[PDB]
Every structure is written in C-alpha cells, then in structure tokens.
C-alpha cells in the first residue's frame, strides 16, 4: 500500500521524511511525498486522487476551500503548527506604529481574517461587535483607528514583503522556510483555532491506512521528535499538554 | 523539445490530440497533454513549470487569477471558444420566468460578472449605470427587477444544476462535455470579450516553440477542422471572419 | 490501482475523461488514458502490458487481429459507437454515381468487408450468394455492376481522401475527429455487428478492476451521458434499448 | 532540462526545495529531489544515472568511496554544512568522563577518523605524531589515555545511541533531523576540511546545467537564506567569510 | 536517450547485459532489456514502439514475418548465432534411423524449411530440383525416402520433444538455454544464411543511437568476449573470419 | 504476487529466466528480474524494498555487509556457484611466477581473504599459523615468500586487469560474464565455504512465496538443468552430492 502525502515546503514535509515515513514503513507501507509551494493546489490534488492525504492547512481554510470548490474532503488529525506572527518590517517595534502605517497580510479570506483579529487585539483597528472571528472581513471593521493601510499579498510573498511595509503578518510555514525565527515576532496570534489538520477524501475516512497514519502522528516517538525539532510550535489540542 | 499542454477536459484537449499535435510532430516536437477538471489548477501548474502552455480561460479570468495568485504568466493567442449560454432548467423558455425564479451561476468573480451582465441584458435585473461589466458584482445591482434568486455553484456543477434551478448559465466547455448543445441555449452572450486565450510563462513569450504552436493554431488546416468540429463556437478575433 | 486505458483519439477518449474516470476515482482507482491515431498499435500495447484495457475496435477486427498476431486478449463489453457512413467526396449525392466512380475504403480486411457489403446494399456491386458478410472480399464479388474503382487506404486517411475520390467510406471515429457529421453521410451501414468492444488480456478477465470498469460503462449515469453527448451512435446490444 | 538532485533527508533537501529549486526554475529547468537516509546509496544512484547531482558528503568520504567502488564522479562546489559534535549521552558533561567511558562513532573510515582526531583534541586519547588526520585509524593511536571504549555504529544509528553510551559523536545531518541542536554539543569539530560538496558524474562537469546549479548555490540570495535558516553551519571556503 | 532492446531468453540477452549495455552507458545512453519466450511477439513489440531494437531472428524469418504482419521494420547488423542442429531423442545416432522414424521440427515456415533441407542433406527425404531453399515446404518434397514422420511444434517446445520423438531439430537459442550443448548435435546445419540480425523500425535506420549500437556489436572488445562466451557460434559475415 | 529478483548479470540471472521464472509462473506468480554489475547495490535494493530476493553473494560477504550497513536481511538457500580462480594475465603459467610478480585481487574484505588463502596454498605467501581463513588480511601474512605485489581493485575490474598484472584472481560471476572460461584458471579455490546464497528481508523469511522460490531452486528439474547449463559449478550443500 503506497500512501501519497502532500505538504507545503519545509516543516510539514520534514515531519514526513524524518519521522512519519519510517514509522509507516515498519508497518509495510511505502510513502511518497509531494511538496507544494502554494496553498491552493493541495486540496484539489487530494480531491482528484493524486494525493491520499495532505498536511498544510487549518480548518477554517479547509472549510472555506472545500465549500467554494465543492470538494468531498475532511479533516482527520492535528499536527504541530508554526504560529502566526506580526514581524518587523521597515519598523522594528510595535510602539513605532504611526497613522497610516502599512501592514502586509495574506489575501485569502480565512487567513486575512486572522490579521484583522490581530490588528484589533493590538488596538490598531476596531472590529464590529458580535462578528464571527473566523470570517472577519473589511466590512466588519467598525473603525480603522490608526488608519492602517493593509497591503494584501499572496501568502508566499509575505516574508519578502518586510522590505516594502512597516510590519508583516507572516504565516508560520513561510516564515520558517524563509529563515525567519518565531521569536522575531513582535506579536504572536494567541488563538489555537488555526492549529493545522491533515485532510483526506471522505471516502477514505475509515481506512486502515489512515488509522496507521493517525497513530504515527500521535505516537510518543513523534511527540518527542516534534518537541525538539519544532520548538515554539502549537500542539494538537488532543495532545492535551 | 517536448511541449506540455494543459487544457480543461473535452473540446480544448481534442483540438490538441486531433489536430495540433500532428502539426507540431511534423516540426520535430513531441507533445504531452494534461487535462484538468477545474479552472484553478491549470495556471498554477503552468507557473510552477509543470506545463509549457495552457488553453482553457478568457482574459478577465487570467487577469484576476494571476493578480490574486502572483503569477508571472501572460496570454498569447485566441482559440475557438464555446460561448456562454443560459439554458433551460426546470423552466424551458425565457417567457416562463417568474418573480423569484432561480438561476444558477458560477461562483468565481470573472465568470459571475458575466451572469449579472446577461441577466441585465434579459431585463431580469438592472445594473447600475456606468459600472464595468467585466467586474460586475452583487454590489453593482441597482434593482433585482424579477427578484431572481442566483444560486452560486462551482463552475463544473452547472450542467447538473439544471435539475434544481429554473435556468442555468453554463460555461461552454462544461456544457459541451456534459452533452449539452449550444443550440439549446435560450440566450447566448453577445460579447466577444471572453473568447479564450492560451497562456504561457512570460519568460517563454519569445520562444521558437511558442511561435510554432501559435502558427499551428492559426493554420488553414486548423481553421478548416475547427469550423467543422466546433460548430457555433466563437472564433479568434484575428481570424478576421 | 491505476487503470491504463488506450483509445483512439476523440470520442472514445472523451468517454473516459468526461464520465468513466470520475466514476472509477470514486471507487479509489486512478486512471491514465493513452490515445492512438491508428488501429494497429492499441492491441499490441495491450498484449505487452502497456495498457490494461483498450476501447477502439469491433469484434470482427479483434477476432482477426488477435488470431493473426497471436495475442491472448478478449472482448469484454460494448460501448456506444459512431456508425460507418459513405460520405460525399468529389460527388455529392448517390444519384451522381457513374460507371467507374471512385470509392475510398479502409485497407484492412474486416473493415474492407463492410465497404463491399455497403456497395452491394447500394446496388453498385453484386456480391455472391451465401457468403460470410464479415469476411467479404474481392473474390466474393459476383459482378462489379457500376465498375466501381475502390481506392484502399489506411483508415485514418479516409477523411482526407474526399478531395481525391468521388465518395469516401469513413469509420465513425475518424469522421467525428475530422469534423465530419454523421448526418452528412449519404448512406449509413445498417448493421449492428460492428458496435465496438473493450478488450483486455485474458488473464485479467476476472479481475475486480475490470468488474468496476464494466459497471461504469453500464451505469444509468453513463447511459444518460452517452445519449446526450453521442447522438446517433449505436448502443451496446446489452443496453436492450 | 530536468535536474535530479539526491540529498540526505533534512537540511540539504530543504536547501533545494526552499531556495535552489525556484532559482533554477527561473532559468527554465525543472527540479526533482530524491532523499536518502544513508550515506552509501547516493553516490551509487549518481553513478548509475538516477541522479544528476548529489549533495550529502564531504570530500574525504567521496575520495574514499569513489576509489573503493571505482566510480567516475567528482566534487563541484561546497554547501553550508552542519558541523560534527560530541553530544551528551548517559553522561552530560566532558569532565564527567571516566576511565572506560563509552563513545559512539560512525563505522565508515573517513568519518571514524574525525572521531579519533576529536578524542585527541579532548585529551581522551593520544594519536601518533605526523599522521594523516584524514585517515586516522586505530593503528594511529599512540595511547588510549582514558581507555575510551569506542562503539562503532552505522552513522544513522548515532542519535539513538545516546541512550546506550556515555557520549555520542553524531554527524550534523543526522543530529539536525533527529531534533538535536548544534548548541547541545559538548565539543564541536574545529576542522573545516569536512564542509560538504556536491558531486556529479565526471562526464557532466562542463555542462551548462551544472554551471547554473553552481551559480544558484553561490548567489547572494542563497547566502542570505543560508545564514538565516542554517545558523551555526560551516560555510563553503569560496564564500570567503 | 533510452534504448530498449528485445531479445529471446538466454544468449542474446546476455550479450546486452554483459557487454553492450556498458558500452552504450559510457556514451550516455540508458538501456533496458525485455526478453521474450517466443519468436512471434518481438517484431510486434518493435513495430508498436515498446522496443527500439530486437535481436533474435534470422533474415528469412524477418522477411517473411514483416510481409505477413505488415511491419515497417528492417535488419541492421548480424550477431554471433547458435547454429541449428539435429539432436538425439529416443534414438542416439543417425545410423539408427528407421522407416517411419519421427523428427520434431519447428512449425513456422522459415525454420521448417531448414529442417527439410537438413533431412535432404542426410538422405532421409529428397527435395525437388530447382526450389528456393529458404522457402522449402512439404509441397517441395519429391520423395519421403525413409517415410520420416515430421512432428511440427512451436520452436520453444523442441528441447522437451526429445522424450517423444526419435530425433529433434532444435534452434540454437532454445538448445543453449535448455542446457543442451552444440557438440551434442548429430548433424549441424552447414549454412550461414541463418546467422541472426538485429532489427529496427525503418524510421530509425539512420539514427545516431543505432550507429552507436552497431559499433558496440562490432568492436574488438565485443568480438573478444563473444569468441569465448559463445563457443561454437557462427559469426557475422562482415567479421570475415 | 509479483516476485522481484535481483542478481548479478550472467549466470544467476539466466537461472531465473531459463528455469525458475516458469516454475513460479505455473503457481500463479509473476516474476521480475533486475540485474546488477556490482556487489554493493543488490543488498541495498533488497533492504529498501525494490527487490524481494537477491542471488549474488556468499555468506561471509553477506554477514560483513549487513553488519557494516545495519541491514535486516538474511540468507535462505544456496545456488550453484562459479568458483574463484587465479587466471593468466601477462604470465601464462604458475611456474612463471617471479619475485615481485603482480596479482590482482578484489578490494572488499571477505573476497580479499580468499586471495590470501589461495596465495598461501600456492606457496607464494605464508600466512601466520592458525588465523581465521574467513577474515585473512594483510596483517595475517607472516612472510611474503615471493614478494608478491597484490594489486587491489573493485571486483568488476578484475577481468580487464589481466592486461596490467601477471596473474588475476577473478570472481566466477565476473569471469563468466567477461567471456573467460573456468577451465582456463591456473588454480581454482577448493573450499565450499563460498557457495552463494539467496538473501531476503528477515520479515519475509516465513512467507509462502519464499517457500515456493526455495522449492523451485531445489527441484529435480532445476538440478538437472543446472548440471547441464553450469558445468564445473559448486553445488548447494543441501543437494548432498
Ligand atoms: C492554508 S491555511 C494556512 C496554513 C499555515 N500553515 C498556517 O498555519 O498559517
Ligand atoms: C476559466 S474562465 C472560463 C473559460 C470557459 N472556457 C469559458 O469561456 O466560459
Ligand atoms: C478497429 S475496427 C474499426 C473501429 C471503428 N471505431 C469503427 O467502429 O468503425
Ligand atoms: C557522507 S560523509 C558525512 C556527511 C555529513 N553531512 C557530515 O558533514 O558529517
Ligand atoms: C526467429 S528465427 C530463429 C532464430 C534462432 N536464433 C535461430 O538462429 O535459429
Ligand atoms: C558478493 S560475494 C562474491 C560473489 C561471487 N559470485 C563469488 O562467489 O565469488
């Protein structure tokens, strides 16, 4: 039985090659890894049969993506996840924010929402009462207190954008793969709602191979490796640590 | 030199296999064709180096997609294109439309705009004066004259949607591959703004292989085949007829 | 398991890409399609294991080919099939036939027989009594009533031959892929003996994958698709329609 | 042209996926990465043609390996390299070393030599005067001052060996991929003679593709990435830093 | 450039794997070998494209086969060939032949001819005057002097036939691979007309890869290897030895 | 079940193609053969899963190899084996040996040991009393009686080395596949300790397929074939001959 994984470049792929693959080969499986630069192809490849499982996204992204693209896919288990941070760009500290400061943000709706929530936590904008934080959008801004100019970019552009904007809100996987350190962030997202999940075609939910993959990502050996290899990452809720 | 084409399923892939491939093999090329079900993967595969050229989209789609996804790709030449039509669903004629009739529409922005423009041409809604039809959005509706309920679906769902809605606005490539006939449309888009284009990475624009592909799609032999094989399609503007 | 289909270009490949592939992907298979422009390679590719199944031929062709070339292959199920027609070449109606008129025909024995049977049905030649129609050959001609000159060509060349002969007898798959319409035929073969069959290696006849492929080609969904997409095609006998 | 890289798992593969691949795609290449868990397979895969280039070894290893196995391969350029360290096992500090303490070491000759040189620098053994440090062997030990018991293992076993020996000398690539941190080493190899090299078949040494690969590994952008992503690594001599 | 060879099992395959493949890999080709148990499939696999070159037949076989099966293939160069022999079966010497003795023979026409010519040379039958020896058939027998019963079998069955017939005429390639020694023959065919040839698709006759294969089969190194690996074999006429 | 064999080129591969494969195909298996020209790749391919079984080595080689590379593989059954020989190089007879004569030898330790034992049996060197012949090394030489210069090479180079040294010690498989004859050896190793073994992954040792393979290599039919095809080979101990 060959299990084909798709991940983004970097940390999630290293998990497969450095730990999970050997655990699954012990049980008789072969393992293939396909890495993707972007957040858009992996669910489509999964749904079209080119992958058996992907590991790259949080559940708000998945729920939105599979509804919009009408994909019969579902989350399975969580994985250690590099958290979201607001990082110094042309400006190096939060106190330096000015009226009109620029903040770069990913341009897809579920990750853009995270930026609006962070900016509201910082007091730089104010969101309307009673909104759904997972779908926060420009229409939900009650007042742009500091007249922040939000510069929307494709997610992979955010590390580079630090040259062009005062502050950059950078997804963890792209921060790590560009050599950014999580400790460089001026403000980290407090939420745990965006710890990432693996996803499969719904038809494969009860499969023996997926049971064995799930066990591999929850073993004592994997937890010990993850705590050493991926310091500062947010853990699966089920690890209850 | 191997040229790798990406197209949607059906008509654009048949152009390659039935006519273009042999023309290019005469000049010493080998040809590979990858067919895609959806409109989202092809430009990303092209930009990431897995395809040399794709043939599946119109320029408003390309312009929106390459901006949103930060892709260094560009259009080259036009191809015969199945036109957009409003087709009978539960209701069989335009005169049967009622207050509250349901119309299915694709859920991506550049193709959704075409449905709003079509409904305005039919007099079922009224768009605000002076808005750009290429970016028509719900916000641009001045009055929903017949209180049309627009049912937004992923584009490939639109042929099957005819079972569930009064009328379906169906993209030509999906209509044709589902066995729908262009002559069954109750109304066809009169614009030529959406005749489809091939697309390449910008770095390849001056290549000899692309010159040879361009010539293949503009040869007397290809035109003679296309006029017979794809009756009722909109021809490239440059074909001049 | 990946199922590798081989078909001729055009209609039989579109059946795979537009309908069968998705049905099989729902059951966990992946699908690869290889398209051929000729009639000789597909059964050789099948027998050598480069294909698991091919869809391109009728049973008289298969019976003759597998015996001549010592191939351990066998038919499985029938598929909707474009019929054989006599089409206008230099002359545009049957009534214009003259003594010595030229008719192009395929040069392989089982398809050539079909042309002799057609010419006898038209009253342009007279075949001997009591012959096997599936193997009709020049020796079976009792009288060449109109002194027809039969121009034998490789089957793929028959659309192009219309410039050189008075009438062309063209196999449906090549007529469709060259942009000819079945309704343009001056006369269509009445027989149902040439509805095409899938073929596999005999060793695979009892496989689960082949059972699932057979089911996909006999489903209500495929039948509904075929009746819309391939109007005028001759149906499998087992569909009993 | 497709360039096939072979690397060990982890850091050298991440260099390809996170930085080098995109640099080469801008010049028109596609890139394939094959990752290995051991030190023996990659040069064999290179010599057989499965790989165009590998990145996993130092030159003393390569010189020995290509001579012993009569392989027509050669080094090209250096890459940032995780250094060799002596790490705590059952004992946690250098001055806890006792008479008879166990030290695990790789069992291949060029890497075993490094352990003997390290033990001499620590004063735990004394090597003979005037030896070749690159081929230091047990015969070159003048006195085993602390009666160290050297436990020889296949190199990939050395991270796990920390449970069984007092101290473990672990190659950097395996340390990193097991979640060990370079700052955890009690003593790091001073030498720069084991900064790793890419290798190719000698027949390819003058190729354009290799020139482009070499440029990609010496670009300002790669150096900036490497200094951030791989802190504490030893740099190519040619970088002159 | 991947050169795919097809051979029968045994000696001709060993030539490729032991000597030719390395000669071609030095020049940068890759090589694959497919082996076949029978004489019918290899030319079909060559014609279909699976093979680039085959080595298994003599020219009378090829001339007959490509005409009968309508294949556009051609001979290129000769190879050292195991000769044809009449071997002991139930009877152990030629002098033991009796009226009615049974002789097994291959059942394909060009190899059956060789048996008739051999039986005529032995004085067991008498062929008619002025016949073409390459096409000698039962119709060409003037008198069956010893009323030999010729038992026609598939060529591969002839080594095993020795249990069932008085004498067996066995093709060299099958003799060698069944553990028979050429010195065991009671009578060996004198002719050199059946020294075997490589064959290719005619389209490939002027290719550079074929020039390089031809050189490998005619080098001083290959001749030295063949003279002792294949003792008793008949050499290419062009070697003029 | 498809059983994948790996062998060195030549004799061990012919055993599979000419006898074993058909014996296993009669029980319903399919068989694939991968041939190697070196001694290092086959156990690595076995351990990685590319092969199910290999046939190329003796047990002293296997024991050393699996320990050095920490591979979980094990021997199963013996096979007829071409013996080790000392062959003429620049000198043609044993009596011509001189002080300083050169003898080429394989450079791997378990095969090098065999050379030293052979040279001691010949009286050209003198090994120390009582040393383990399986691990004989240069340090076990008491006196180099004839000041032999031993030229160590990778094993596959040893046939060609005959141009450069006075005498060459060549492994049987390489002697056969280079067109050397075993009967032309000046001295053949008499020991039976190096009759070769098949090897598998330890996890497969109790499999049904391996039981069927073992039976195939010990059948009366295989023994009869081997004694004809491989004259002068050393037989498996289990054959009790
Ligand atoms: C594709 S959704 C974003 C995933 C990314 N790893 C994150 O946690 O921010
Ligand atoms: C991806 S944009 C839509 C393309 C489609 N062929 C059309 O013309 O409607
Ligand atoms: C290869 S036999 C001919 C097949 C063709 N599709 C026909 O029905 O005429
Ligand atoms: C294969 S030689 C050892 C290579 C390893 N990356 C090191 O620098 O220690
Ligand atoms: C396929 S023709 C027969 C070939 C065989 N090698 C022979 O020389 O007898
Ligand atoms: C790989 S160990 C050497 C094997 C060789 N066939 C021999 O018996 O000498």
From TrEMBL, chains A, B, C, D, E, F:
Similarity comment: family membership: Belongs to the nlpA lipoprotein family.
Membrane topology reported for the UniProt record: Lipid-anchor
Protein name, entry field: Lipoprotein
Cellular component, GO annotation: membrane
Keyword Coiled coil attributed: no
Coiled-coil zones: none
Location(s), subcellular: Membrane
Predominant place of localization: membrane
Keywords: Lipoprotein, Membrane, Palmitate, Signal
């Amino acid at each position: 039985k060959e299990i084909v994984f798709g991940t983004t470049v970097g940390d999630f792929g290293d998990m497969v090659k450095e730990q999970i693959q050997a655990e699954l080969e012990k049980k008789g499986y072969t393992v293939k890894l396909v890495e993707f630069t972007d957040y858009v192809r992996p669910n489509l490849a999964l749904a079209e049969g080119e992958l058996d499982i992907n590991v790259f996204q949080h559940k708000p992204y998945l729920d939105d993506f599979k509804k919009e693209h009408n994909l019969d896919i579902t989350e399975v288990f969580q994985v250690p996840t590099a958290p979201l941070g607001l990082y110094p760009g042309k400006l190096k500290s939060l106190e330096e924010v000015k009226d009109g400061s620029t903040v770069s943000a990913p341009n897809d709706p579920s990750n853009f929402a995270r930026v609006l929530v962070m900016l509201d936590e910082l007091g730089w904008i104010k969101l309307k009462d009673g909104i759904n934080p997972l779908t926060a959008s420009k229409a939900d801004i009650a007042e742009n207190l500091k007249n922040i100019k939000i510069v929307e970019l494709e997610a992979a552009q955010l590390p580079r954008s630090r040259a062009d904007v005062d502050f950059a809100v950078v997804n963890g996987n792209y921060a790590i793969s560009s050599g950014m350190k999580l400790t460089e962030a001026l403000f980290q997202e407090p939420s745990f709602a965006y710890v990432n999940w693996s996803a499969v075609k719904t038809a494969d939910k009860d499969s023996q191979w997926l049971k064995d993959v799930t066990e591999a990502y929850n073993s004592d050996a994997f937890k010990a490796y993850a705590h050493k290899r991926f310091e500062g990452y947010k853990s699966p809720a089920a690890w209850n640590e």
